[PDB]
Write a protein that binds this ligand. Structure first.
Ligand SMILES: Cc1cn([C@H]2C[C@H](O)[C@@H](COP(=O)(O)OP(=O)(O)OP(=O)(O)O)O2)c(=O)[nH]c1=O
Ligand SMILES: [Mg+2]
Ligand SMILES: [Mg+2]
Length: 342
DNA sequence: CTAGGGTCCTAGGACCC
DNA sequence: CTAGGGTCCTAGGACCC
């Protein structure tokens, strides 16, 4: 045999950084997100805000109606990136088998670690404590024989705790595990399963695999596997970004093409900078645009293209604007690139 | 009264052999 | 008295943080 997988996850990541750097924000409801005037949402919130119901992805106006004392911060990305680089270097003291999933979390494979006598429990404990020292931030961790259980486990003694699932404990832990707790099983999937009388991993273990393949395709095989603790996904330390985009939601819907082009002119230098970091010569596989309309419908138009090119993005966006807008107002415009393969 | 990044999967149809 | 099957494009969506 069994692997030893750790998932490490920072507690309230953006709000914890802001609370550390400004202690007057410790005991008051705060969130990182865009204002109502800017038609924004909540990136995350601290625990004082959360007991009022403030959640990641909530429209900021709803957040303020739920928590009128909410203090709203714009977010300091360089502060968060600095912390994220530090925790990942901490991870590297313990193993090179590191798969970051976002700024604030990573799977570790410590199957063959000679740290703490190979105890994944003590390694996770030591990683959490080293992060508290040095960074003055708290993390939670999960320890399990496979990825998705380690990720579920990191949520169970959150914040500032951990939870271990041994191979012996997996069958009991699975029997009653709500399917919605499985990463990748979101609102729509969960509801379709519920409509089918499937709520827990116990329910799916009684199910015909062919039946699940019929109704769900590949996802049905994943659901069948995870429901009995099968998850052979290896921790991969060699993943690279495959795309780069820049996009903006305007405070007011635009209705004139010239406004669309003007926004593209503002977006293009930013996309160029970012593509330059990871690909100095700007060579790409595809590039294209995104529009989102006043009804929250959105469309993307992209095409094979060898090199980032502003004039081609504008011409593309003119086509999208002319052919797909349908007379609607546009609330967002975005630019997009997909990188080459090897 | 609904962000901005991204991952991955599926599907319809063009293209290739 | 005409190509199926594979691959490539491409748009859209579920989902993740
Ligand atoms: C979920 C989510 C997170 N984020 C950002 C803000 C978070 O600080 C960071 C990591 O998100 P999460 O790890 O999902 O949330 P969190 O760490 O803030 O809360 P928890 O302690 O329960 O794990 O990513 C968004 O911008 N939008 C989102 O929808
Ligand atoms: Mg977190
Ligand atoms: Mg996280």
């Amino acid at each position: 045999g069994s692997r030893k997988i750790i998932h490490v996850d920072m507690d309230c990541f953006f709000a914890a950084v802001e609370m550390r750097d400004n202690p007057a924000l410790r005991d008051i409801p705060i969130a990182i997100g865009g204002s109502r005037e800017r038609r924004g949402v909540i990136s995350t919130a601290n625990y004082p805000a959360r007991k009022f119901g403030v959640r990641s992805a909530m429209p900021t106006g709803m957040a303020l109606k739920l928590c009128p004392h909410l203090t709203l911060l714009p977010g300091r990305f360089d502060a968060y990136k600095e912390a994220s680089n530090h925790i990942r270097e901490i991870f590297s003291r313990y193993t090179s088998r590191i798969e970051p999933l976002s700024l604030d979390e990573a799977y570790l494979d410590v199957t063959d670690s000679v740290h703490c006598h190979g105890s994944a429990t003590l390694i996770a404990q030591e990683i959490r404590q080293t992060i508290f020292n040095e960074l003055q931030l708290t993390a939670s961790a999960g320890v399990a024989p496979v990825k998705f259980l380690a990720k579920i486990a990191s949520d169970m003694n959150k914040p500032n705790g951990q939870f271990v699932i041994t191979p012996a404990e997996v069958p009991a832990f699975l029997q009653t595990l709500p399917l919605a707790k499985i990463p990748g099983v979101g609102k729509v999937s969960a509801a379709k399963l519920e409509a089918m009388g499937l709520r827990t991993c116990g329910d799916v273990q009684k199910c015909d695999l062919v039946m699940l393949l019929k109704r769900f395709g590949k996802f049905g095989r994943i659901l069948w596997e995870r429901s009995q603790g099968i998850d052979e996904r290896d921790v991969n330390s060699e993943r690279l970004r495959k795309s780069v985009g820049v996009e903006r939601t305007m405070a007011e819907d635009i209705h004139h093409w010239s406004e669309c082009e003007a926004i593209i002119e503002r977006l293009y230098p930013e996309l160029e900078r970012r593509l330059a970091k990871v690909k100095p010569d700007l060579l790409i596989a595809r590039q294209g645009v995104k529009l989102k309309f006043d009804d929250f419908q959105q469309t993307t138009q992209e095409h094979v293209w060898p090199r980032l090119n502003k004039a081609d993005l504008i011409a593309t966006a003119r086509k999208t604007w002319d052919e797909r807008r349908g007379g609607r107002g546009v609330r967002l415009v975005g630019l997009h690139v997909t990188l080459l393969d090897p």
